[PDB]
Design a protein around this ligand. Structure first.
Ligand SMILES: CC(=O)NC[C@H]1CN(c2ccc(N3CCOCC3)c(F)c2)C(=O)O1
Lengths: 150, 151, 150, 46, 346, 50, 50
């Protein structure tokens, strides 16, 4: 309950935080100043980087381990993968473009849009077909992010 | 919008505006007649019959203010089964009391002697109710068959 | 929204942000093409259901700003579950005939709001829907006047 | 009764209540048979 | 010993509660009208062929216990009181029997009736609840194929079984490809396009308004007649930067795809649920164990787990074992002999 | 210089983040401030140091 | 909690890719186990010596 009284008074301050933080991680946990188990993961045969291992642990292990048997607060040594886009100032300026254009292009070209369904919720009578419509789907590959139109 | 000639474009002109359902996905028919009701889902660790009785309670103070035609109906209810469970169990208890009184009589000739076991076990029954209550229990389908079996 | 969309725009965001919760058996999720996700967390028997509700409902809070604003302004709920009902109080009409769209509204505007609040009722399921200002756009009349839904 | 009263799984309050109810009933029946029943077996019997 | 071993095991007896129910499942992409027809058939089966029992029905279109949608339908059936149902044929069991038998005949869909498993649906035994989890990064389709392989190998050599999926039928969908290039050329904003589409075909939550004191919602969608068929996509036009309307089919592109209407997940991982019942000969654990080695014959990346159900009794051996100890020990507290506690034991 | 959380994207089933920053070689020294230009209202680029 | 960590982590090992191997630095378990061991041992030694 001590967790609650805090976590819920935080709730009354969230809309007063910058939106950069709100869409970032806000956490309320039970603290223990030291660990106990430190399950290190390495590679031997099929060599994968320390940036690959971190991701794989954070994409098959950490999500479950943090949920299991009242684990307080899993600290990950590394980071899960992410679509990383390294802007070039010159190539941006040479084409007359700002970071804002890149961000806008991503937020517009990479998203999932909610479209209705054929044979909608209230139908015309005698309608024989009901099927959902799929609009834009979130991008998948790196190459797909390569072909973003600026 | 207001067009070039000063003609106004009301929403009425571009869209049929009606006070309609928020969701047209589900439709309920009671005995073929168009209807709608309340499907109450229980809460985890709730009191069941208390909750239902109080549902009837809160719903009771709405009936007088209903418009013409608006009538209540009760499909899928659990209450009568609980009530008839209690009834058909207690009935069995009493039947066991009488049937043990008769065996107590058709063995002990004395009419004054066949009162003792008839007096003993109702006391023992009541004490169990006190114990279960003091232990956090309640009148359950198991804590009644338990009584009858223990008799 | 469609199943593919909601499965990774509302569902996964909640799931990944759902960890560090005491006494948890499992977390099973259904993503419905109706655009409806229902995540169930089962807790070890005899647990404090009241606080078990909290540990989840409050870890949801740390994922809300990562949900689409379409969902945020829509209904998000955290409830105690019971796989079956008990009372099903059906309401019909006899004299002054009102449609099944009228009855649903009246029950959802005089009964449901109170009944859902009374005596620890878990989760009232309404058979129909409360009224709403419904505006049915005509594509031609929109285009003929040069107008978009926007 | 009391050993099998040690419930488990989802069959908890099942065997639990179904035992402890009869155990309570037993201890009560015994006390009654050591207090009430003897006294009534005395007092007036024949 | 023989009369004990050959005694079939149960948990709690299923009994007439005077109230039962029946579900209806239409095929892929079925409409409200069709399932309404089936519901009519069911409802009035209960209304004309069983009057001496049925007091009232409460059919609901668009809402099943599996989920929501136009595919499902439910029917709550309340019967007359126990008195007016004298025969065993009027008990829930037989009624549901003949009902299911009729529905299985005169229907072109799946309709079942079921006596309420007293208490919450938890626990049945002599059956299981299997869960197929996608451990690796395999797609939904590979998982579906693996599920088909499991459901095929199980029924390949049923000492039997009865296995099925959970309701993931996977129905055709209508994919629309919005070409960003053409849109940027003609002068239409991607935002505008998207919100026009979404508001027109799926509606949108706009604002709130007061109705007779109570605040209710304001939804904008479109007349039904302008959104029932794919060709209706063209009917919608979008304002461009130059103030000129644009046909949707200009920047658009359409094609029919294949996807699932119900995406299941077990513990943060994509999963598909298999519901199956144990052998008519064997038991629960035998079926489960003789199903796990089947699941261990699936491609790499596909694992398994048990949920609700598969998670007498197992305690009974130990519980009677303690009852084997406390008894002997209590047969000494008032009876000292080391002979008396061997007397009543027989 | 500090990157920014843009949107989310699906990777092998699991939803992960999309970050935009810049190549390291264009943000290690203070003099690198000038390398960045900004579009103005007149559609002409502007030196940051301006 | 630790035993159950080993539990949840146990059902991931078979699906690992080539090379992906586990290692255990900084553990508390053996100290607890050896505590119990070296204490019970002392108990028995006291029993015999008495
Ligand atoms: C709704 C609710 O939560 N009610 C709590 C119950 C629990 N309880 C109780 C009584 C005796 C015991 N004991 C007595 C001594 O030890 C054995 C059991 C116990 F464990 C618990 C009681 O009085 O009320």
């Amino acid at each position: 309950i001590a967790q609650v009284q805090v976590q819920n008074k935080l709730q009354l301050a969230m809309p007063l935080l910058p939106q950069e933080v709100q869409q970032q991680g806000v956490s309320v946990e039970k603290s223990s100043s030291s660990f106990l188990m430190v399950v290190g993961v390495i590679n031997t045969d099929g060599t994968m980087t320390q940036e690959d291992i971190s991701d794989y642990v954070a994409a098959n292990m950490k999500d479950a381990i943090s949920r299991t048997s009242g684990v307080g607060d899993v600290q990950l040594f590394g980071s899960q993968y992410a679509m990383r886009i390294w802007m070039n100032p010159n190539e941006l300026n040479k084409f007359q473009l700002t970071p804002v254009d890149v961000i806008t292009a991503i937020k517009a070209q990479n998203a999932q849009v909610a479209a209705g369904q054929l044979g909608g919720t209230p139908p015309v009578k005698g309608q024989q077909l009901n099927a959902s419509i799929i609009a834009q789907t979130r991008l998948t590959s790196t190459e797909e992010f390569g072909k973003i139109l600026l | 919008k207001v067009n070039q000639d000063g003609s106004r474009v009301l929403l009425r002109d571009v869209a049929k505006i009606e006070l309609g359902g928020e969701n047209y996905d589900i439709i309920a028919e009671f005995n073929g007649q168009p209807a709608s009701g309340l499907g109450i889902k229980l809460a985890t660790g709730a009191n069941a019959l208390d909750t239902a009785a109080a549902i009837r309670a809160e719903l009771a103070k709405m009936e007088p203010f209903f418009p013409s035609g608006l009538k209540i109906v009760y499909p899928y209810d659990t209450t009568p089964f609980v009530k008839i469970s209690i009834h058909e169990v207690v009935k069995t208890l009493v039947e066991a009391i009488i049937l043990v009184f008769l065996v107590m009589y058709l063995f002990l000739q004395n009419f004054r002697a066949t009162l003792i076991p008839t007096i003993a076990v109702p006391v023992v029954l009541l004490g169990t109710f006190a114990v279960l209550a003091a232990f956090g229990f309640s009148i359950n389908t198991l804590t009644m068959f338990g009584m009858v079996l223990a008799i | 929204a469609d199943a593919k969309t909601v499965q990774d725009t509302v569902t996964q965001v909640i799931e990944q942000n759902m960890n560090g919760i005491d006494n948890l058996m499992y977390m099973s999720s259904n993503s419905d093409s109706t655009g409806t996700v229902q995540i169930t967390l089962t807790f070890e028997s005899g647990t404090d259901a009241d606080i078990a509700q909290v540990q989840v409902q409050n870890k949801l809070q740390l994922a809300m700003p990562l949900l689409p604003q379409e969902v945020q302004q829509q209904g998000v709920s955290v409830e105690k579950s019971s796989s079956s009902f008990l009372m099903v109080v059906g309401v019909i009409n006899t004299d002054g005939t009102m449609t099944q769209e009228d009855i649903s509204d009246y029950v959802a505007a005089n009964m449901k709001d109170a009944i859902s609040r009374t005596s620890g009722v878990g989760d009232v399921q309404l058979f129909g829907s409360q009224y709403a200002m419904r505006i049915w756009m005509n594509p031609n009349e929109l285009n003929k006047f040069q107008l978009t839904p926007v | 009764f009391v050993p099998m009263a040690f419930f488990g799984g989802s069959t908890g309050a099942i065997y639990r209540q179904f035992s402890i109810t009869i155990v309570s009933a037993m201890a009560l029946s015994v006390l009654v048979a050591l207090i009430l029943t003897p006294a009534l077996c005395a007092t007036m019997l024949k | 010993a023989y009369l004990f071993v050959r005694l079939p095991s149960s948990f709690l007896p299923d009994e007439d509660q005077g109230v039962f129910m029946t579900m209806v499942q239409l095929p892929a992409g079925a409409t409200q009208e069709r399932t309404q027809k089936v519901l009519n058939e069911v409802t009035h089966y209960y209304l004309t062929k069983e009057k001496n029992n049925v007091e009232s029905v409460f059919a609901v279109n668009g809402f099943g216990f599996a989920g929501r949608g136009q595919n499902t339908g439910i029917a709550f059936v309340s019967l007359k009181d126990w008195a007016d149902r004298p025969g065993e044929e009027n008990k829930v069991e037989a009624i549901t029997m003949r009902a299911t038998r009729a529905f299985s005949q005169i229907k072109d869909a799946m309709v079942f009736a079921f006596n309420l498993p007293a208490i919450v649906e938890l626990g049945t035994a002599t059956g299981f609840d299997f869960e197929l989890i996608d451990q690796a990064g395999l797609g939904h389709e590979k998982l579906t194929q693996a599920r088909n392989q499991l459901l095929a190998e199980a029924a390949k050599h049923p000492m039997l079984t009865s296995v099925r999926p959970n309701g993931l039928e996977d129905t055709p969908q209508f994919k629309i490809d919005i070409d960003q290039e053409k849109a940027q050329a003609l002068g239409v904003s991607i935002n505008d396009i998207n919100t026009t589409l979404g508001a027109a075909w799926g509606g949108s939550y706009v604002n709130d308004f007061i109705d007779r004191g109570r605040v209710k919602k304001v939804y904008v969608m479109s007349e039904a007649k302008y959104r029932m068929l794919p060709d209706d996509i063209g009917d919608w036009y979008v304002r461009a930067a130059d103030g000129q309307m644009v046909p949707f089919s200009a920047f658009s592109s359409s094609r029919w795809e294949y996807g699932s209407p119900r995406l299941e997940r077990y513990n943060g991982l994509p999963s598909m649920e298999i519901l199956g019942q144990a052998a008519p000969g064997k038991s629960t654990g035998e079926a489960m164990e003789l199903m796990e080695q089947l699941a261990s014959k699936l491609p790499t990346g596909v694992g398994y787990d048990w949920t609700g159900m598969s998670y007498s009794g197992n305690q009974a051996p130990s519980l009677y074992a303690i009852s084997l100890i406390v008894v002997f020990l209590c047969l000494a507290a008032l009876y000292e002999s080391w002979s008396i506690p061997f007397s009543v034991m027989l």
